[PDB]
Design a protein around this ligand. Structure first.
Ligand SMILES: Nc1ncnc2c1ncn2[C@@H]1O[C@H](COP(=O)(O)OP(=O)(O)OP(=O)(O)O)[C@@H](O)[C@H]1O
Ligand SMILES: Nc1ncnc2c1ncn2[C@@H]1O[C@H](COP(=O)(O)OP(=O)(O)OP(=O)(O)O)[C@@H](O)[C@H]1O
Ligand SMILES: Nc1ncnc2c1ncn2[C@@H]1O[C@H](COP(=O)(O)OP(=O)(O)OP(=O)(O)O)[C@@H](O)[C@H]1O
Lengths: 568, 568
């Protein structure tokens, strides 16, 4: 005999539409058994749950069993496999036999791709035989049903493509338990927090927004982490209290952790009352920093510390960018009301990497959105079929994690091979690209930014609205801007600040023919030269004559570094 | 019923940070049970302890149990396995059932890779079933918990790669019990010596200091080795005594070991009184020399006697190296104040056998930091999913014992498999490597040095600053160095040594454009020419005229060999 378990039904949320459908399909046959028998009409047999790992498939099934109050028979992937070639099949029979005999019940097949994979991919005579056993069992249920047998077979899988097309046909109902979005994460957070006394400064909405690739289990842990962090105050109190009851002078201490441990060991039968404290928003942020995501090894690319303050001038461009990208992301309400469709893509042309990197990253950071950077010819192969498949993969990855900015650096290679007939490989890639661009735009969230140092030879087809229609021209040469950049870089140091020196450096001819990346390099070069001076002087004095170290940087260091460094 | 044991908590030391973390996670749920029940918040369930064998994992667990005063349930690797196919599973259930019933308790799973290894590596139907039983038990605990059930599951393993990824996910907290310290070894030595009568000249502190990568088991053996060494005096005494009782003249001897054996055999029923002697410091040093752990594949690697005085010239390279490695280790204050992130790695490229290994050791030695050397194909295994986990392990070990220099010799194997699509295994490994490199930059202490005799096909991604960005070019063209090499090779011969000849040979133009391998070949070539002279002369004289053979080598042989041989 196998009775049901006690799991919390108030734990799962964000699955409103799907749970409703499940309820409709499962409630009538299980709960009103007498009614279905009298009518003579047939019902739903198999319910397949799919989606990514940790999506709450196992929990949903467990919850449903507990809530209805029916008998739960858990069939895990390797639980039926035995030692001898026959015991496995015998067990499958017994499972189905006992199940049909006792009703109402819920049979749950957790991780089904391990038992019933494609019969062409399995060259073993045991695996094919097991699939056959399942099929036979399914038929037996169908025949017995009009008497008073009420059993529903639930199943969970992570990938539908790995399953045998034959079993797919047998199963009738399918529920998609998809990716936890911003809204979904918010809901999950609320479910977990339900039993906790939250403070007024805590905004679960803010937490959800700044939580990219976290799953239901991860969020569960973030909540637990916050709990431990809050109870550090009580630990400090106990330490002070212990050192007063049992002093032990300085004999109990060799280090800090060991002394704390020893005091607690001495106490033993001492019971203490713990005050119920509230958690802060700061504690949650601390907890979030210490937690790890799931999709971290893929094409994620983290957003740098680049803001608008790092970009000198280009105020007109800044405003235009805000309108296009920040407008639809932050204000969807505004766009729906007026009547226009959100953006798809923009194109940047002019100076190089320095200008492009500062633009691409600044906009991306500000929106607090994801960023992916694919640079020029670092995609092409000698073979005929991986290049196109790779491009498809990039867009799929981008689609999965929205909001995201997809950045294409140096497009002068791929695009001009259309106007004149030359290569076949280049033709295929560009055509796939055009195709991918047109496809996305209705659902949005994915904004494509293209950049090139050369605007002349480009195909007009790519330029067309809906693809990369917004052509933004970028230019960097101006003195006032350079001074601002120098100040911004030298702002992040921590006495001697020296403003006059910064202005003079900017005035020089060599500085005029520079870029953002060049100025950064100049700063680093000056720092290195200064270190050389400090090292040579200090070592000479210490050995011949221990003194203090001086991290101060003067003009002589800047001048020498300036003389050597060249642009691009 | 199973009550706690009485083990000394003052025995384990050197684990300050780790013990503190363990305290935080284990103290609150076990000690203040009433408080956690009232609040309704959830806590930590599983704590996994990893690291090498004899690191004190079993002792730490035992100590923690005794110190807190909770019930200790020891579950060893083969303690739950029975005779029939069902008794094993029944026992696992009973363990979890009794454990949840009685609280507060600590369940300790010692050596878990024997019970729950990878389910793909286990083709048995019993092993997979046992893993399933553990999973089911884990879930049962989680459900029961809000009532008043307080049980923490501790576990110890020697290798994280062998564990099933499924159980890894179930366990939440992980503690790394890495490299044993100087203080810790001192303590272990004292524990073992406890029953022995040590002399006054023995300083256990000195032993511990000069014992780098030895574990608890190794130290145990060093003590045993000392015992055998002392009892050699008694052996000599018995030998002399035996040769007096039963002389047997010279009939009992053909060799030395055999005669000794024969005498003892004759005696049989002769009982002798053994005097209790004290061990010396000299005997311990002798014992230490004969002991060897080797640790891992390469394991621990002590720093050689290589300084800057062993390297001829390359003064520019020396200064650059000092800046990068010695700069951040010795002067962290300087780097934080200026504003730049510490080094992560450098690359050494040039001609075959120029002394790349020697330069690497010199830098490491000078910083008085640790050194690990992993050479080319001495990394690859037969397994697939273990390669990536092994790389992760290396970085974890390096992180634990910082400051350390991680040296990769002959990188020509791993790096070129990016520019052209080879396979999937190579792709995963290199991507994991890039990931590991990016992570280490702010935390630092671990500086990665790469060396290769071939620079052509390498991915630019690895070359980027922050990874192996600093490309240092090395060569070998100095006269003084060549003389030293010639002397070193001609040192291993055994009359006529001749120093003047060696210097002149080095001076020649043909010698200037050479390498270490070339000089070795020249020496061999000269030896061959000399043999020809000896053979022709000896045969002519013996036949026409048996005389003696002359192994002497003059300058004429060297000159002829020198004329013919060409470089590479
Ligand atoms: N949608 C969700 N809402 C609340 N909690 C969740 C959700 N999804 C997962 N969790 C938490 O994560 C845990 C894992 O859930 P579960 O094992 O059901 O996921 P899964 O999709 O079945 O994973 P797998 O299929 O790989 O076993 C649950 O115990 C739950 O605490
Ligand atoms: N860190 C340490 N401090 C003091 N003594 C130690 C330490 N580590 C080991 N020892 C000594 O060595 C013995 C072995 O310890 P223990 O069995 O806990 O190591 P282990 O890591 O659990 O080994 P394994 O996991 O292979 O069983 C202990 O009884 C102790 O006397
Ligand atoms: N197997 C060895 N490992 C390290 N040092 C060696 C070895 N054999 C000789 N040496 C030392 O190095 C000098 C010889 O240099 P060699 O031509 O072997 O180049 P190397 O870089 O030291 O060795 P390798 O090229 O094998 O790394 C000698 O002075 C000798 O003392």
């Amino acid at each position: 005999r196998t009775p049901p378990t006690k799991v919390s039904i108030l734990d799962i949320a964000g699955v409103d539409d799907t749970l409703q459908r499940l309820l409709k399909e499962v409630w009538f046959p299980l709960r009103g058994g007498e009614a279905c028998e009298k009518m003579g009409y047939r019902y739903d047999n198999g319910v397949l749950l799919h989606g990514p790992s940790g999506c709450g498939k196992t929990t949903l099934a467990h919850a449903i069993a507990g809530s209805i109050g029916v008998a739960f028979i858990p069939v895990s992937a390797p639980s039926v496999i035995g030692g001898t070639s026959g015991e496995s099949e015998k067990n499958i029979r017994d499972v189905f036999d006992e199940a049909i005999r006792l009703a109402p019940c819920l049979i749950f097949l957790d991780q089904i791709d391990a038992i019933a994979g494609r019969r062409e991919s399995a060259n073993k005579g045991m695996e094919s035989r097991i699939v056959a056993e399942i099929m036979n069992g399914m038929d037996r249920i169908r025949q017995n049903t009009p008497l008073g047998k009420n059993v529903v077979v639930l199943a969970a899988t992570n990938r539908p493509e790995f399953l045998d097309p034959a079993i797919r046909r047998r199963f009738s109902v399918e529920i998609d338990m998809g990716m936890p979005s911003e809204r979904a994460r918010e809901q999950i957070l609320r479910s977990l927090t339900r039993d906790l006394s939250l403070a007024d400064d805590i905004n679960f909405k803010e937490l959800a927004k700044m939580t990219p690739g976290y799953v239901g289990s991860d969020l569960q842990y973030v909540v637990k982490a916050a709990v431990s962090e809050s109870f550090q105050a009580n630990i400090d109190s106990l330490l002070a209290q212990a050192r007063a009851k049992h002093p032990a002078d300085h004999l109990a201490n060799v280090s800090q952790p060991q002394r704390d441990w020893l005091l607690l060991e001495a106490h033993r039968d001492e019971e203490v009352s713990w005050p119920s404290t509230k958690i802060t928003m700061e504690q949650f942020r601390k907890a979030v920093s210490l937690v790890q995501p799931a999709s971290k090894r893929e094409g994620f690319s983290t957003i740098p510390d680049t803001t608008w303050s790092h970009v000198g001038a280009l105020e007109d461009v800044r405003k235009k960018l805000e309108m296009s990208i920040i407008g639809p992301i932050k204000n969807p309400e505004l766009f729906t009301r007026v009547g226009i469709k959100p953006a798809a893509g923009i194109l940047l042309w002019g100076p190089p990497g320095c200008g492009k990197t500062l633009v691409a990253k600044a906009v991306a950071n500000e929106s607090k959105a994801n960023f992916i950077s694919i640079k020029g010819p670092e995609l092409l192969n000698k073979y005929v079929g991986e290049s196109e498949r790779a491009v498809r993969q990039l867009f799929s990855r981008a689609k999965s994690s929205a909001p995201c900015i997809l950045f294409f650096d140096q497009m002068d290679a791929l695009v001009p091979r259309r106007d004149d007939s030359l290569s076949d490989a280049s033709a295929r890639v560009v055509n796939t690209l055009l195709t991918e661009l047109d496809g996305v735009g209705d659902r949005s969230g994915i904004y494509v930014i293209g950049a090139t140092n050369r605007p002349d030879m480009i195909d007009e087809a790519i330029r067309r609205p809906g693809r990369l229609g917004t052509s933004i021209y970028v230019g960097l040469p101006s003195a006032e801007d350079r001074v601002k950049i120098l100040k911004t870089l030298y702002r992040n140091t921590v006495q001697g600040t020296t403003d006059a020196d910064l202005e003079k450096v900017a005035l020089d001819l060599r500085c005029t023919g520079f870029s953002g990346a060049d100025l950064g390099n100049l700063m680093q070069a000056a720092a290195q030269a200064c270190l050389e001076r400090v090292y040579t002087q200090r070592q000479q004095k210490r050995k011949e004559g221990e003194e203090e170290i001086e991290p101060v940087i003067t003009m002589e260091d800047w001048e020498k570094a300036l003389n050597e460094v060249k642009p691009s």
